[PDB]
């Protein structure tokens, strides 16, 4: 046992490692979307910038979970970061819907992690999750939902000017 | 074929995708080392900071390779980022030796990529590799070799003060 | 032979003169597009400004090639700058497609020039081409491809608001 | 007929297109002279800089004529820019004499254009010519005459120090 | 073998050591010229300053090659720096011609070194040579050719005012 | 005889030329030590920086001596700069001991030169030596002796942390 470990269940450690992997995977998916929108035949610079920012924020979230794991004396065990489920995201609207789904799944994983921390009576872990990940996830999901709503109302993807003007105005 | 693609062989595209994956893997390995040195029972803050910086630089290298792939009209195809070969790096000296080996392998991959670009007469790709990756790799390998040499001479790992003072002076 | 001439093949000199002419011709074509978009019945100020900037950059490229020719002791031999293949570019999208084709042809000529310099073992000439023209051409071709993609998706030229809003947002 | 066109004769439009071509040709001749003086075996940096400045000013004059053509609703029709009558300008004094002759011919063409505008009672065109081109040409011709006079008195070209010290003092 | 050595042929190491010696020798020759022009019976302060600057730049080039040798894990092997071919450079024009010849020979050695690096497929070495030495050599040879042209046409050395005024104007 | 020469014996001129050569040789030896400590398997950055500074100071000393030679109307006669007695300096302590020996030998040569200037009653030369070289040599020898003493007491070379911490603290 780590000299610093206290009130840190093994299941919480495993859940934190899994969450680390999931945040790294979300960072990778956002990197994939940024790459897709930097394509010459997509060429939506602000979509690419937005998703690159999301990828960097996901990487920061994973690093914060790593710091938490070390703080509590748990041991980080890294897994393979699976490739994103696709390379062609096919539109700004589809990319935003997939990002919304990804943020909802990351939020569900964080909610399950908070439930586990609550069951194991790990108040520091619960507080960490709710302070640094749950509110961030709710804000991110709301922002992604707003983006999806606006893109759909604009007529995306069929309305060709829709994604371009959303890129300039909302994301630019 | 991409509207922008010109003098960009398919083998060069595949090699660039593989290099993207390798740079992402190196970033992941450096993140693993940073996590290891942030452990309470390792507690080498400057080793962790140095390897986190290496991880971020590797991620930037992968991002620049993907920007190159999009610039040339190639399509980025992301693969699984394999987990690092180990989670316990066991010492500052061992971590530096593994980082040296990783940078040498990344440099070897970049050299093979430059050879491929030369064979396909892709001067832009060759020049890009040279200006942004080969000199960086040579500098990184030299810095890692210096770190390893200094740690060895200081008596790392068995000289307990060696890694601590190297952390303070060289990496701090 | 020039007192400064060294490792500068006659074919390299001729290729550099031809490239000078081609860059001057591209500058002239971009001037033609700028003139077209300054027309009262086209009236796309940012398209005109963008293509005038391209014309000035092309003139700078030709002047840099002339400076290179004098640096290496070759003699600049100027030819007629042929008129652009048309005076009516008929749309922002068509002008962007023609600019993309022109930059691709300039890049192809630069690639052939780099191949010639490589065959004649003129490393300074190869390095000059790849440092100052190849990366610039790749960036320009990518930017033009992005412009063309965005204009096409916006519905240009048929979508009358497409070129106007692209002029304001992307080019303004 | 252009929506903006009024009191703009077809002959004025053709004369403006011809003047555009002539100004582009003068810019090209000045570029040739700048290139000649950048030669290693001529090596008069201030002569080259002076003639490059003349080339850029000629290009600006051509661009202003194009702006005038579009302002009046005339259509710019670009022609081949003929190569300068020679590549070897053989001296600072000879280059200055050729520049003087070129500016006198450009001024003669501008005077014929002003006569045409006067005959067709195009007061805006006459005023444009006289405010932006005639005074500029008179000043340029006077400056070139001064340069030629000083170079001749200094003993150019046979006086070896003459062109060097003129380059340093007058043009530097 | 050095821990950092990778894709660094022994012939490249030997060629780099020879180039180091040649750059040190060129620095020594430039120091000799600076000394000659600081003589009371020569007394060309700007010629001496120019050649001292050349000597310092040559020493910097040798030091950069030394840094490259250490970066690649090659071992620097210093040789005797041969005395310059003469102590009396006899004139500003003769010194400039000898400097031109020396820079051309250094450039030839660098070109052979780049050819060797190309044959050994050492892209980092080729890139290093071309980015830091080949363009510098071309610029230096062009500047020296310009100096020689101006001095010759000013009447140097027989025209006694020629070297003095070149010292004041071009070199001052 | 030089027009400026006065009270400047031929033996003093020869001794000054020999001192030129000796200072250039010391600069070369210090460059060799700097190169040795920049090696990846030595990797003592501050030792390398210190010895590079010593090399540059030795070059400045030689340059000052040749300025003195020209000031007095003597003629500088440069000789071969012999390669340093070794390429492998094997240690920070050994390099410091060799630097101490080299500074002591340079000081002995300067003392013999001052004795010669005294015998020839050349008060300006004696004053120059004592003002610019003797005090500098005494300070340098004392600093090198301090460095050697501290390295020996620290346990260099066998104490592996000794040279590293001396590099950080004294030389950093
Ligand atoms: Fe300490
Ligand atoms: Fe809008
Ligand atoms: Fe003067
Ligand atoms: Zn990398
Ligand atoms: Zn170009
Ligand atoms: Zn004009
Ligand atoms: Zn050099
Ligand atoms: Zn000294």
Swiss-Prot record, chains A, B, C, D, E, F:
Query: Which family does the UniProt entry place this protein in?
Result: Belongs to the ferritin family.
**Residues at which Fe cation 2 binds:** 58, 103, 137
Where it mainly occurs, coarsely classed, is: cytoplasm
UniProt GO MF annotations: ferric iron binding; ferroxidase activity; identical protein binding; iron ion binding
This chain's protein is named Ferritin heavy chain
The GO biological-process annotations, alphabetized, read as: immune response; intracellular iron ion homeostasis; iron ion transport; negative regulation of cell population proliferation; negative regulation of ferroptosis
- The UniProt record lists the Ferritin-like diiron domain at 6-155
> Do you know which Pfam families this protein is assigned to?
Ferritin
What EC designation does it have? 1.16.3.1
- This protein's gene is called Fth1
**Subcellular compartments:** Cytoplasm; Cytoplasmic vesicle, Autophagosome; Autolysosome
Q: Where does Fe cation 1 bind?
A: 23, 58, 61
Query: Matching InterPro entries, A to Z?
Result: Ferritin, Ferritin-like, Ferritin-like_diiron, Ferritin-like_SF, Ferritin_CS, Ferritin_DPS_dom
- Function in brief: Stores iron in a soluble, non-toxic, readily available form. Important for iron homeostasis. Has ferroxidase activity. Iron is taken up in the ferrous form and deposited as ferric hydroxides after oxidation. Also plays a role in delivery of iron to cells. Mediates iron uptake in capsule cells of the developing kidney. Degraded to release iron upon autophagy activation by nutrient starvation.
The UniProt entry's GO CC annotations, sorted and at most eight, read:
autolysosome; autophagosome; cytosol; endocytic vesicle lumen; extracellular region; membrane; mitochondrion
Summarize the record's disruption phenotype note.
Answer: Homozygous mutant embryos die in utero between 3.5 and 9.5 dpc. Heterozygous animals are healthy and fertile and do not present any apparent abnormalities. They show slightly elevated tissue light chain ferritin content and 7- to 10-fold more light chain ferritin in the serum than normal mice, but their serum iron remains unchanged.
Task: Please write the reaction equations for the catalytic activity of this protein.
Answer: 4 Fe(2+) + O2 + 4 H(+) = 4 Fe(3+) + 2 H2O
| Swiss-Prot/TrEMBL keywords | Acetylation, Cytoplasm, Cytoplasmic vesicle, Iron, Iron storage, Lysosome, Metal-binding, Oxidoreductase
Q: How does it assemble?
A: Oligomer of 24 subunits. There are two types of subunits: L (light) chain and H (heavy) chain. The major chain can be light or heavy, depending on the species and tissue type. The functional molecule forms a roughly spherical shell with a diameter of 12 nm and contains a central cavity into which the insoluble mineral iron core is deposited. Interacts with NCOA4; NCOA4 promotes targeting of the iron-binding ferritin complex to autolysosomes following starvation or iron depletion.
The record lists the lineage as: Eukaryota, Metazoa, Chordata, Craniata, Vertebrata
Top-level class of the enzyme under EC nomenclature: oxidoreductase
């Amino acid at each position: 046992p780590s000299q610093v470990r206290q009130n840190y269940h093994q299941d919480a450690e495993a859940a934190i490692n899994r969450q680390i992997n999931l945040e790294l995977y979300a960072s990778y998916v956002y990197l994939s979307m940024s790459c897709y929108f930097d394509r010459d035949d997509v060429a939506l610079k602000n979509f690419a910038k937005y998703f690159l920012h999301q990828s960097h924020e996901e990487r920061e979230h994973a690093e914060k979970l790593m710091k938490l794991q070390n703080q509590r004396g748990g041991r980080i065990f890294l897994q393979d970061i699976k490739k994103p489920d696709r390379d062609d995201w096919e539109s700004g609207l589809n990319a935003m819907e997939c990002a919304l789904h990804l943020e909802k799944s990351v939020n569900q994983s964080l909610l399950e992690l908070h439930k586990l921390a609550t069951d194991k009576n790990d108040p520091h872990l619960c507080d960490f999750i709710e302070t640094y990940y749950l509110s961030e996830q709710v804000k991110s999901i709301k922002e992604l939902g707003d983006h999806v709503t606006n893109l759909r109302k604009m007529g995306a993807p069929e309305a060709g000017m829709a994604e371009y003007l959303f890129d300039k105005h909302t994301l630019g």
